[PDB]
Design a protein around this ligand. Sequence first.
Ligand SMILES: CCCCCCCCCCCCCCCCCC(=O)OC[C@H](COP(=O)([O-])OCC(O)COP(=O)([O-])OC[C@@H](COC(=O)CCCCCCCCCCCCCCCCC)OC(=O)CCCCCCCCCCCCCCCCC)OC(=O)CCCCCCCCCCCCCCCCC
Ligand SMILES: CCCCCCCCCCCCCCCCC[C@@H](O)O[C@H](CO[C@H](O)CCCCCCCCCCCCCCC)COP(=O)(O)OCC[N+](C)(C)C
Ligand SMILES: CCCCCCCCCCCCCCCCC[C@@H](O)O[C@H](CO[C@H](O)CCCCCCCCCCCCCCC)COP(=O)(O)OCC[N+](C)(C)C
Ligand SMILES: CCCCCCCCCCCCCCCCC[C@@H](O)O[C@H](CO[C@H](O)CCCCCCCCCCCCCCC)COP(=O)(O)OCC[N+](C)(C)C
Ligand SMILES: CCCCCCCC/C=C\CCCCCCCC(=O)O[C@H](COC(=O)CCCCCCC/C=C/CCCCCCCC)COP(=O)(O)OCCN
Lengths: 121, 98, 105, 171, 83, 347, 71, 175, 115
Amino acid sequence: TMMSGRPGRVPLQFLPNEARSLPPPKLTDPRLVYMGFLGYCSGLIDNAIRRRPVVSAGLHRQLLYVTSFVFFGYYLLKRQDYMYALRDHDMFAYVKSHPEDFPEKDKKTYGEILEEFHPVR
Amino acid sequence: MPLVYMNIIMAFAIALAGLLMYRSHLMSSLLCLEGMMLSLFIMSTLIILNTHFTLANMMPIILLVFAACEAALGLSLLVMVSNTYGTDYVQNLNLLQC
Amino acid sequence: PFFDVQKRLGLDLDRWMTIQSAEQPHKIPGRCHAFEKEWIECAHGIGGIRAEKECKIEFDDFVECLLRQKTMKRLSAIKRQRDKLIKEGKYTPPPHHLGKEDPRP
Amino acid sequence: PGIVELPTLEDLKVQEVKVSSSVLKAAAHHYGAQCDKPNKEFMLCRWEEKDPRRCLEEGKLVNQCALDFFRQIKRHCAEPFTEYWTCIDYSGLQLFRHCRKQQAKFDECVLDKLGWVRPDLGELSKVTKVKTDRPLPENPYHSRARPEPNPEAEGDLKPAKHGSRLFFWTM
Amino acid sequence: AGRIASFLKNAWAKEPVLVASFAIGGLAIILPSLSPYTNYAIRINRATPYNYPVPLRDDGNMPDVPSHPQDPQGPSLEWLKNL
Amino acid sequence: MNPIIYTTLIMTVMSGTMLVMISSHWLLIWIGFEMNLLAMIPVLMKNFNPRATEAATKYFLTQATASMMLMMAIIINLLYSGQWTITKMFNPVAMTMMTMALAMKLGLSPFHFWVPEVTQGISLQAGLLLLTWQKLAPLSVLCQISQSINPNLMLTMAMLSILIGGWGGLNQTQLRKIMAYSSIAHMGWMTAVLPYNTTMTILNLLIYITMTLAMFMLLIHSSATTTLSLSHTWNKMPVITSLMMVTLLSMGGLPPLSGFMPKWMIIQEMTKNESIIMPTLMAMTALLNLYFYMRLAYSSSLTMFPSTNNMKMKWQFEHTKQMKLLPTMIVLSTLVLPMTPALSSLN
Amino acid sequence: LFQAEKDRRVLQMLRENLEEEAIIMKDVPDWKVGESVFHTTRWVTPMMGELYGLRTNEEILSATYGFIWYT
Amino acid sequence: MTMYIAFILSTIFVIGFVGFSSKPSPIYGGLGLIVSGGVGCGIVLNFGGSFLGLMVFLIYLGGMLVVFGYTTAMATEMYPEVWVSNKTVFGAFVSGLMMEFCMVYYALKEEEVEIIFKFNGLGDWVIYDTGDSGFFSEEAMGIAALYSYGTWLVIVTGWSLLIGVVVIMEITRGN
Amino acid sequence: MNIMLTLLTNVTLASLLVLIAFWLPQLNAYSEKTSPYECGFDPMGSARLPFSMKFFLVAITFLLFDLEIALLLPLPWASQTNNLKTMLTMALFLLILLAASLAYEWTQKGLEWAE
Ligand SMILES: CCCCCCCCCCCCCCCCCC(=O)OC[C@H](COP(=O)([O-])OCC(O)COP(=O)([O-])OC[C@@H](COC(=O)CCCCCCCCCCCCCCCCC)OC(=O)CCCCCCCCCCCCCCCCC)OC(=O)CCCCCCCCCCCCCCCCC
Ligand SMILES: CCCCCCCCCCCCCCCCC[C@@H](O)O[C@H](CO[C@H](O)CCCCCCCCCCCCCCC)COP(=O)(O)OCC[N+](C)(C)C
Ligand SMILES: CCCCCCCCCCCCCCCCC[C@@H](O)O[C@H](CO[C@H](O)CCCCCCCCCCCCCCC)COP(=O)(O)OCC[N+](C)(C)C
Ligand SMILES: CCCCCCCCCCCCCCCCC[C@@H](O)O[C@H](CO[C@H](O)CCCCCCCCCCCCCCC)COP(=O)(O)OCC[N+](C)(C)C
Ligand SMILES: CCCCCCCC/C=C\CCCCCCCC(=O)O[C@H](COC(=O)CCCCCCC/C=C/CCCCCCCC)COP(=O)(O)OCCN
């Protein structure tokens, strides 16, 4: 709908070249840590379903789970940030290019505005 | 719009209603489906012939091909239903009621 | 939903057949080729929402070429008035409208 | 919306080339060899204007040149040409193949009397240049002014203020 | 390469129709790529004038476009007359 | 069935869906639908019995009628505008025909009748395929033409689907019919937000597919097709039943589970418009789905039903073939709500 | 030559139709004689209903099904 | 209004559709659909689509032969029904006939909208093209372009046909 | 026009032949003469009872093979295209798949009648 068609957009890129001008998410980002937690939970559920010692059965496969989730999460976060940056860029440009639709109103002080008073009793 | 277009569209609507209404034999419903293909083919051909679009002259051929695919599918299903029950009556297809 | 693999790869799997103004064999033109190209050009690059209101004239001409409702109504009106006037009997069409003309090559 | 302007009947009057299709097919090769310039001017007008009303004089020139060509044929030898187009007229497909002798006689006459050489295979189908003083039409499609496009996406990308801004999230 | 001979012997003894069909189909598949006459067929198809050749406007910078059909410029079909 | 033929048929189904998704031509989308149906019919009949034949026949008849209507809508659109490209759908009558055709392909009410019968009549693998993969193509086409979609008709069908799924699910003891009715209700939730934001439609689609894959894979792990056969699972696989109960809660839509996120986003998107009454009715109706999910959870995990003596022999044997991604689907189906803002990578 | 002759013949038939409908429809109060149904002012190929509309049914059938029925 | 041939053919088309739409036995439904296929072939002949009309006639003739075989094998009864042997079949037949006549009358008499938008009639000859061009036929060139332009269509169609053969094998396997 | 006249003439001639055949001779029909023909005796069942079809699988394949004819009949015109190499590749592809479908049904005993 709203973002589906935009000028100069490569169809299946998933990460345009203009996204590299944004700060990458830190490796200690809390969302990445949550993705790693999801990987750990997947590994534990894998151990429990297959009737293996849940905490200690397979360490290599649990590590693979955690790193796979973190790896996908990093690029997911990059794309998320890029799309939000595009949204803000477009909104600001549209506000700037249409001044008559977003006019700066007169600043009034609370000493001048008359608000009706509703007593509590 | 011409009047032949009315006639073709009425033919399509009649075939659709005939398919929707079920009497007994499954075969008659497949006949209605094939009639709907026939009407769609005629309508497409007339529109394609009237405005000289040259490259769409092939799409009625593809339409007939996939019509035949539907017809074969329906015939295979009718064979299996008749083998199960001995008749192609839609009244027998009620096991999934419960 | 729509994965534009063709646009990514530059493939042209089915775009050759979408419009009447696109490279027919032996350069055979559509009946409404000029109207369609005018509508597409005017329509191009402005987006769907803008296009309906802005290019409405070109699309209206294209639809008139495709279905010919207005021309048929005008011809029917002229024919009906002519029939009424000949029933009244004050028109007497010329010989060249009764097959009594002099044809030309 | 608007009035269609049509030529008057006196503007559509010319001397007609009233020979049948067999006569025309018998003459066709030499006619294309000789009458090429007016025909090419007319056809350039035709595909450049896209309007029959803007190329009437060129068509009248086509008729005039064809009439002079047939007048020359009638003046110098009409008997071999009559035999040739009688052949062509007999067959239902008007095949050239069915008498090459009468065509040979016609070619010999037009070569040793008028100095005409029959075009070879692949010559009448060539795309040729034609030199005309007629100005190139500025806008034959009568197009309007195209609407102005959406301006552009200009500027450098900066991170979203306060991130996503969805409910309670801080990034 | 030794057992395939016996396989073909058995096929020719029992299913000559299938052997003929496969040989003919394989020849039809492979021969057109090894023929020098398919290019001639393409060029014959390309030289058939179905449509009217619309003339070009003379701008003075076309040394290879004929001004008349009998001019030496343009494509030649002498290869076709001798073919 | 031969494994090679089965793989070929599954890839033909998937290729038909992909052809529907990657095509800009109406005829090619129709061909994709037809190829999908042609390869899909035998898969429902992989295990042969009269019920599978019935399900295949009913599915074939419904999808063939839908294909009829879709081709007729395409032809009418061509007649009123010589366009073959999937776009705004210049004619409204053709648009109504197309909307009903795609809704009947999806199973939206009042065309919902075929879904419970077909799901019950086939195996759990074919049911998984039918209720997950077969929804992508019609929803993709609906997304592509949502600008010209009529709000009155689409929203009516969506509300009808939610109501009917909730009501029909209450009466069901078989698990496949419960899954079919929940599928109908989720379809209604997906198509309600379609005229407003297709990103929310895609998000609900992905969440529903994850939950449905988890639930079918759990029902295949514990070979249960009825309520009482699933009541036995706690005596052999307690962990499976606990995971199933958490997945059911997620399906119900209670926070902080993954299932809550799609409805939460759809309600927000609808209230960005005026649209206040309809989301309220949608939530109050999804309460019914939560109710019969809780009935299943009571029968399967929160109470212990009587068992049989022969279960002692099953106690000695392991599950032979383990389906991959079951652990991943469970985790994504429960613990993903904190990652909600990542939906911005969907538009 | 055939192109030139066809252009002249079509234009003459259109002019005859123009004069005839100018005579016929002049009684109608608000009828614009010769009005086009298109917004554009470029030439539009006729429809055979605009050429043979006022002529006899024999000519109409010879123009419509003449080549199709000639076998 | 010139010999009404296209009108008559389209009316017979609708009549045949009503005939087989009634479901008054497969043998007679096949006859009705055969008649409809023939008259539709004629309808598209009258517009210049000779190849398409002939080919659809041929295809439907083959299909109806297969359907006749299948009707004698698996869709038959002691007393097959004809259009006058049953009240429901006759009622549907006459209802379809009167509906067709009613829409024809309300279309020829008045230009009033039925479903999509009101039409004109005036004879379908009016909307022709005056097209004077070509030593070939447009339809045949368009159909022949299936091999030069329509590579993708050929690929998908051939795959569908091979898959359909496999599918009928698997469905009728049995067991 | 002429094909319509030809069809009308042929149908009318056949109909007049039937009319002559039915109204010229002396008819004497009684219940025994018009009874169904078995060789000497009365039939046990009806001719409207189901008649089993042992080649039902070949009949369905005939529908799919018949539509492969609609795809190949425009081949005489397709040979006149400029780019013959892509046409010949597509025409041979359309026949190899037709040959492979025939081979598949043959090897899986699809061409054998039900016993
Ligand atoms: C918000 C904050 C965080 C919260 C997040 C959410 C919760 C946490 C994540 C959840 C997923 C993680 C684990 C899932 C798989 C585990 C399955 C399991 O059974 O576990 C058995 C396993 C014990 O089994 P075992 O030792 O192999 O041998 C005994 C047999 O296996 C015994 O086998 P058995 O066959 O006898 O078991 C039978 C039993 C088995 O049934 C179960 O165990 C239930 C399985 C849990 C379902 C999980 C579904 C997905 C998660 C969704 C959570 C929802 C949260 C939202 C709130 C709603 C609550 C539902 O079933 C029953 O008896 C029927 C009871 C019916 C009760 C119904 C309620 C069940 C659902 C409740 C789920 C709530 C969350 C539970 C989390 C922990 C549960 C283990 O438990 C564990 O040992 C794992 C616990 C966690 C390990 C972490 C330790 C790491 C190191 C510690 C140090 C930390 C950092 C150090 C650094 C510091 C520096 C010094
Ligand atoms: C429970 C969550 C379910 C998640 C479902 C599976 C999770 C893994 C997804 C698999 C990742 C690979 C998919 C694509 C990677 C490369 C292909 C690339 O080209 O995709 C592009 C972009 O990638 C995908 O479009 C986005 C995939 C991102 C999926 C994750 C979002 C999940 C929703 C929020 C829930 C939080 C999940 C947290 C992680 C578990 C397509 O761009 P575009 O051609 O223009 O889109 C056309 C269709 N549109 C415009 C209508 C959208
Ligand atoms: C092959 C293609 C070209 C053919 C060209 C010639 C066409 C020939 C016409 C076809 C009929 C020829 C049949 C030869 C004998 C005629 C049989 C029948 O038509 O005549 C009588 C039909 O008449 C009625 O039965 C009774 C007559 C009462 C009705 C009056 C006739 C209607 C017209 C009104 C009166 C005008 C009389 C003629 C003056 C103009 C007999 O009827 P019926 O007895 O059952 O059957 C017995 C026939 N037998 C005796 C020969 C065995
Ligand atoms: C990139 C990754 C693909 C992975 C997916 C594979 C699945 C699909 C199979 C292969 C993709 C098919 C793409 C072909 C699209 C056709 C268009 C393109 O290829 O050009 C054509 C090239 O023609 C070639 O013949 C392409 C076909 C060759 C492949 C043979 C078919 C085998 C495909 C495998 C699937 C078929 C199922 C059965 C297996 C045998 C035509 O070129 P040309 O004629 O210059 O231009 C025509 C336009 N004109 C008129 C202006 C001149
Ligand atoms: C590369 C070319 C591809 C296109 C060309 C082919 C076009 C048409 C040919 C294929 C059509 C379908 C093929 C049918 C396959 C039949 C398989 C089969 O099962 O047949 C066997 C019979 O045949 C066999 O035994 C298997 C294959 C036998 C030979 C088939 C061809 C082998 C290769 C021959 C040529 C090799 C390459 C060319 C070199 C030729 C040497 C000069 C079974 O016989 P039944 O009739 O069922 O038994 C009833 C009697 N009791």
